[PDB]
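Justification of computing resources. Each target in the renewal requires a structure prediction run like the one illustrated here; the chain below, 39 residues long, is used simply to show the kind of job we budget for.
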Amino acid sequence: CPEEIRDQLLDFHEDLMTHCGIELDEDGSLDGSNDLTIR
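Resulting structure tokens:
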């Protein structure tokens, strides 16, 4: 099977949110606070 058992690969889709683009699209995806306690 693929890596993700659920449907496809990751987070219900890739080329959506944070991971296909990480040069600054991750940096845009990490928008504000309240993502982790290390903030």
